[PDB]
């Protein structure tokens, strides 16, 4: 049960999910990267929630 055991990212700012394919993140949270094939939106996993967030709101930790 280590869904956060993947490519990690840092949440630079607070974000609120707008669509069912979006997830809410908070500044200072460590997000898990699931898909970064998009330049503007990155699919991440927070705790248990999977969805997309602004790529400009997240930074590669690795």
């Amino acid at each position: 049960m280590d869904e956060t055991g993947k490519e990690l990212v840092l949440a630079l700012y607070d974000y609120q999910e707008k669509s069912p394919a979006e997830v809410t993140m908070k500044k200072g949270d460590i997000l898990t990267l699931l898909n970064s094939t998009n330049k503007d939106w990155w699919k991440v996993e927070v705790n248990d929630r999977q969805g997309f967030v602004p790529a400009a709101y997240v930074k590669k930790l690795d």
Partner: peptide
């Protein structure tokens, strides 16, 4: 994947 531009960084 959202087919639109994401919100600008605050």
């Amino acid at each position: 994947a959202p087919s639109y531009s994401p919100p600008p960084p605050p």
